[PDB]
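Subject: Interface between my chains keeps coming out wrong

I've been trying for a while to get a sensible model of this assembly. When I model each chain on its own everything looks fine, but I need the whole thing in one frame so I can look at the contacts. Pasting all components below, labels as-is. Any help appreciated, I'm running out of ideas.
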Amino acid sequence: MADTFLEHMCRLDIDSPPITARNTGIICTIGPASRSVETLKEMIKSGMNVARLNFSHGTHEYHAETIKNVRTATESFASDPILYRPVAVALDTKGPLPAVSEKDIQDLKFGVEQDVDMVFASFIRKASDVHEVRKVLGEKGKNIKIISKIENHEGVRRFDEILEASDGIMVARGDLGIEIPAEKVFLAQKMMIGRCNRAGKPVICATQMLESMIKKPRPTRAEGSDVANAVLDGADCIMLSGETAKGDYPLEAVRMQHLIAREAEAAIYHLQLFEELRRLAPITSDPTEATAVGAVEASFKCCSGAIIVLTKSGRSAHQVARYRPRAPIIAVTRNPQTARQAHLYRGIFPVLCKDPVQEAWAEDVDLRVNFAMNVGKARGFFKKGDVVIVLTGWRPGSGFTNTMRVVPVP
Amino acid sequence: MADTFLEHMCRLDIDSPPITARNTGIICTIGPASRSVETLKEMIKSGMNVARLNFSHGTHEYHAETIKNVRTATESFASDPILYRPVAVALDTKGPLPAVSEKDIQDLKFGVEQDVDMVFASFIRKASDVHEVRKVLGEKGKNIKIISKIENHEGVRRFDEILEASDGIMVARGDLGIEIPAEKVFLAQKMMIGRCNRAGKPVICATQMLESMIKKPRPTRAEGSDVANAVLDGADCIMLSGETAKGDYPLEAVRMQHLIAREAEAAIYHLQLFEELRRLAPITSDPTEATAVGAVEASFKCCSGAIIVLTKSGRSAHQVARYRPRAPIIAVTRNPQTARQAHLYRGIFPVLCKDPVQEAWAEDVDLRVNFAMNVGKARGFFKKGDVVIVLTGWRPGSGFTNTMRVVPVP
Amino acid sequence: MADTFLEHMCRLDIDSPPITARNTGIICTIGPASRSVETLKEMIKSGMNVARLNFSHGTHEYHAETIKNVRTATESFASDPILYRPVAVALDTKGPLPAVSEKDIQDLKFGVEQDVDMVFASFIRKASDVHEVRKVLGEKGKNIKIISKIENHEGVRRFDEILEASDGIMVARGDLGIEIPAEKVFLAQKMMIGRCNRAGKPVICATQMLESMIKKPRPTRAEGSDVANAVLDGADCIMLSGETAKGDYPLEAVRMQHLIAREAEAAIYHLQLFEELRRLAPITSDPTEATAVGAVEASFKCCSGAIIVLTKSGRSAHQVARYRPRAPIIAVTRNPQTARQAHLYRGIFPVLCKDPVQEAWAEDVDLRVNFAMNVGKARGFFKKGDVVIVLTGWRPGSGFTNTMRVVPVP
Amino acid sequence: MADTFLEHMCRLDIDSPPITARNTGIICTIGPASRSVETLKEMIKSGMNVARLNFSHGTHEYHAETIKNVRTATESFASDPILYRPVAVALDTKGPLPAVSEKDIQDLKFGVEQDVDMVFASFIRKASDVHEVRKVLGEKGKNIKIISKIENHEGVRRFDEILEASDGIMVARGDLGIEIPAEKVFLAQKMMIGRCNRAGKPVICATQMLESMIKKPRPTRAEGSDVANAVLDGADCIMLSGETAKGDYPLEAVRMQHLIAREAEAAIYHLQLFEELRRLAPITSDPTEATAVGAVEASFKCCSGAIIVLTKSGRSAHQVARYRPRAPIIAVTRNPQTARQAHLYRGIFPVLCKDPVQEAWAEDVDLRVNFAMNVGKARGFFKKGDVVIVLTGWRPGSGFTNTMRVVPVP
Ligand SMILES: O=P(O)(O)OC[C@H]1O[C@](O)(COP(=O)(O)O)[C@@H](O)[C@@H]1O
Ligand SMILES: O=P(O)(O)OC[C@H]1O[C@](O)(COP(=O)(O)O)[C@@H](O)[C@@H]1O
Ligand SMILES: O=P(O)(O)OC[C@H]1O[C@](O)(COP(=O)(O)O)[C@@H](O)[C@@H]1O
Ligand SMILES: O=P(O)(O)OC[C@H]1O[C@](O)(COP(=O)(O)O)[C@@H](O)[C@@H]1O
Ligand SMILES: C[C@@H](O)[C@H](N)C(=O)O
Ligand SMILES: C[C@@H](O)[C@H](N)C(=O)O
Ligand SMILES: C[C@@H](O)[C@H](N)C(=O)O
Ligand SMILES: C[C@@H](O)[C@H](N)C(=O)O
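Reply #2:
Try treating it as a single job with all components included. I did that and got this:
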């Protein structure tokens, strides 16, 4: 509400409570210390959204035993449709030299077979590397998202063409810190989050985020600040590498990542952010992009508890996320793959609707809107009497999102 | 589209054509040289919205002969519902001393009987003067709008309480220029338009706007600049006093006021304006105020040709007007008094729907939306294939406006 | 002091008194009704800075009789060095076809002989017209300023190259209003003042400013607004054509132009202006441009009564004027031609020092600074105890202005 | 140079080299692993400005042996006046209950005797605690700076009155993280740096900044980001606790703190910063505050290599520092205590002039200005031909700084 950024800082208060919604997603690496169906259930309850499998080490048989476990734990909560949370799987290729080695070709092939939701591609140096990965996945894996790991000086120098070729970006700070002067990594990180924010592409901040929590149940002051600063810069997700894989306190690390992220999302200077994104937004005759910027403006003005968006490809939810609302974006979808991929975008809380398609199309749209009202009350994002923004289209199918209603919570 | 106001000026081009819609309303005084049913038809075609009757001079019988003429000319175009334009009548009291003299009490009483749409109240010095006028009008005239003429130093000094008590304001520069130093009038004018803009109340700029056009068919360079500068400041309507009443060129004066106003509406620096109005807009749980700010933001982003708003009391249209969109605001209403009062607010092009109320309420809402698509094509504000913003409510009656759809022109 | 432009308007007050300094210069046309040595004395006291001679009509002998009169009236006040005001002469060519007709060649030649301070060149259509005028003036008139009158659509279309070729610009609204649609003139005027402000070139706003004051001792409301709006746009000088030449009230017109201009200079939104000029100012290693922007920033922060600048070519004073300070700019110079040309730039109050050059150069700089303190007290711009910004160089000669001192008034 | 903060981020480049000047000061704790006269020399060369002694542990005799060592190492470089760097000593009280325990009274008394430059006061909960410390120091220690360590929830809640009572602030994150939820520490840190920036008071960011560098010669990615983020927030100094006291790599830690800080000072968005500080700066008739804001504006416009400021109490240098210039601020002083205290303020590079006071006061001012030109060339902040801003007063003694000259480097 402050007019300067300096006044905004000065007004920050450690007594003012945060909101119940977390906006930043959480990717955890699954290793030895978290592979168990019991430990996984606890991390899904602690707010893990994305289970990452590292194909540096292990056979295909070890990894397929990890994928079974992740899915078993996930489907354990499937009985209550209101409380179910979809969990994505991510494959992280070893990488290199050629863009795709012989090992990677078999791994990527195994990924399509095991039905992963995304691929983190290692050692991306140019757009033609991303085209090589996309070809190997084929037509069977055409709906798999490719996140390019930036890891060297040439990858940084040619960032713009890689971002145009990708589905999103991973600032992989470990390797980036080996191949450039460690004092410069913070600059590369901010440049890349800036540019991904402007394109509307998801950026993941990774590596040595909670490093001291491998051995001790509490982070250092630096680690608390680091996670919070990635969140304030505009990272879409944050990653836990060794902390979840090999350390002694997997759940504590996930719980610490949850707490920091809510707190830092309450320190964002949204008025300057929403403004700056708009003065950069191209005017077009696209209804969907107009409905979305309308919805974000409305939500500020009435301080809505949520933006509800009905989505098949997730595209309509991605566009709202682009404008960085303060309310959580509840995306309702019948497509299980769409619901898992949604975790990459800041703000989107996906909910998977299981109810069958009613004969009357307007009855079917009402069912899904109420479903999303139930989830929001259950999870405590809003209470009966609050105001929500619902976003829908004028006919069935993708690409027709045109309507925006301001409704009282039933 | 420029980032500074200085760059915005520098980019202005005399070769770039204006839009077909005029946003600033036109009030003309009816005198001897414009009282005729033939001259009136020509001024309605030239874009007169409000016919003002000056109760300084003339009997009640002379004035009732003016009102008959205004209405006859108006109803002559009533055969084509698409082309009909509603025309308001305004009563301008003589005024004073007491707030309401004996003459004014009879005049205001005559106004209620003759069914005027608004009253310009002379010599308003304090809020309790506006309360006196409101009492005299009674309950029979409770829906008549009271516009307070500011005309002296005490009226200026106590502006804020008068604006809170009024339905809108008239900067009456003639008398204001007699009672304060003429070099200060420009300051008082800007202060008052600033403050009325911020409250969302209509302000009228009046007196000696096209003074040289009483005798000559062309204005001076100063007069062209004056009308344009009132428009750029944010006046809702402009007034022609002697030029339409007594001069030789009534139609030329109306036609000159039309041309200047379109041109100056294309020089507004809308990005700074819309921004500044929002940072001053109180957050509330009012759906209507959220739907409206959503609609204005959407309309910028898709450069829509029009905002269509369905309105009974006109209230929903007043709220969109508050945010100063660049598109014309087509307000569709079945209430003839609402359609005439709408001329006071910047941007609102009212259209009066005559078609009977269909049994199905959604069919009835569709009828009025198509009606407003027909008027916009006919008048040339948009063509089939263009994008419009339609604004409607979720149930019948006032105060329920909640929906905003981005639609292709049928 | 307000953060928005809307808040700035709303805060304007007709009871808050203006400052004693006028910032906008005044050019008056000398005709039959103002040619007399007695009437001229009265206009110099009323605040005429520039006497313009129209070479449309009259012989060389009639005009040389005007120049004698202007100079006699001027030199009458020369006895008191503190109160003396320098008065420029301007020649306005008839113009056309070729850039310079045969008549113009003789007139321009007569101008160099009679030692005019500037030339208003009529019907400038392209940069090569300004080069033709510059060649005719020769080397004897190389220090004469050429102000290009814009008067047609091609002159407007090619504005940028003319401004690069000129010493300043005159928006000649009369002819510009004949050759383009009168409703567009206000746009051309603002474009040109925008662009001259950004280049740091003087722009004059001319023609039909106080047109009703030819016959009546009081302006219309439109005329009061027009002069004020040119001042608010950023015109450097304003012009009186027929009002001073042929009308009944020459002194009243000059006195009205004085009053309006002080009042409108107190409504400028200086914080946005100074900001926007800086973000457009190229960084360079030029000391003079750094000393000047330093001085304008200092003057805001201490609300100084004046910027004193010692100047030979006037160049140092032109650079301060570029940043549009709120304090008057007292330019002290020993060069009589520099002191007359200074009237073209907004803010500069020139003072001509007559005292002989002291042997010690620092004693000579102190003499001129005290001289400028005396003039400021005498004219009432500041009183003993107030804070002023003094601007000087490190060695004698042009181009060395480097020092900026904040001093108490002695 | 970018117009948004988002564009500014996007333009950041890891190939663009930083400037030679560091702006953020470095405080190192002296413990067992850095107490030696040989190790100290190496840390002074690596860019240690402030040697902090922790009075938690050790006798008075152990500490007085540390103070001797620090001063011996410092005075070893005193032979070359151009290369000498002044080094401050800081006493950090154990603290508590009463504001000052019995131990603290003896320690503070020992501090005055040993002639320390500042005191870090532990467990400050209210303004009256700072008054207690100030009384104990007496009149013998009246020129010692009191930095209040904030360390609990009541210290945070009553921040404003403590800041008004203090000479500066230390965000002590270790203890602050024990007494409030660790996820909130980042918020408290930013609030406090915001508020100290606005008051113009030095803020120190402390504790677990390079924690992994106790055992390993390289920081984690989080630690690189943490130091950089404190610098970007607007911390004046950064602190190394255990890393310099007990760890294996004292010099590597100091060298890493140097590198990160130059790099992060090249990512500041100075245009928004300088703007926001000015719109918050009170207008006053104080010459010094006007000369200072003038100097910072000039330095941006000519991209000066340095601001040279001649200072006795350091006050004139503190005021320039307040506006956060991009150039280093070379403060020239004959007062050794002033030169050591200057390390607390962001940007000030103090230089201690040893040359005797010349008879002619202007010759004496020229001597010190040239001295500061020599140091800047020697250290590589600028080269002959570059432009510098020199700041001086009109007479001898404190409080008279009024002049600002833009000069070529001799
Ligand atoms: O984000 P996407 O993939 O464009 O989906 C948006 C679509 O969702 C809907 O609101 C619902 O349509 P379905 O019932 O076919 O899912 C459509 O009106 C709209 O076009
Ligand atoms: O501007 P008002 O007076 O609130 O009118 C808005 C009303 O118009 C409607 O859209 C149409 O309702 P009606 O059919 O009763 O006119 C309502 O849904 C809405 O509440
Ligand atoms: O504006 P100009 O023509 O550059 O004049 C500025 C000059 O005026 C001075 O301050 C005074 O010099 P003079 O005594 O020679 O006029 C010089 O130091 C400076 O270079
Ligand atoms: O920052 P401080 O303590 O006010 O010192 C500024 C003083 O330094 C000077 O420039 C130099 O004076 P000294 O020669 O007495 O040090 C004075 O003109 C000015 O008043
Ligand atoms: C960001 C947050 O909403 C997360 N993706 C979740 O679904 O819980
Ligand atoms: C402003 C403009 O729309 C006018 N009120 C009209 O109805 O024509
Ligand atoms: C602008 C004002 O200062 C004028 N030029 C004068 O000298 O009086
Ligand atoms: C900040 C930097 O200039 C430091 N104080 C030094 O003197 O080296």
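Reply #3:
Confirming on my end. Residues 22-96+98-267 of chain B form a domain with the TIM Barrel fold (CATH 3.20.20.60).
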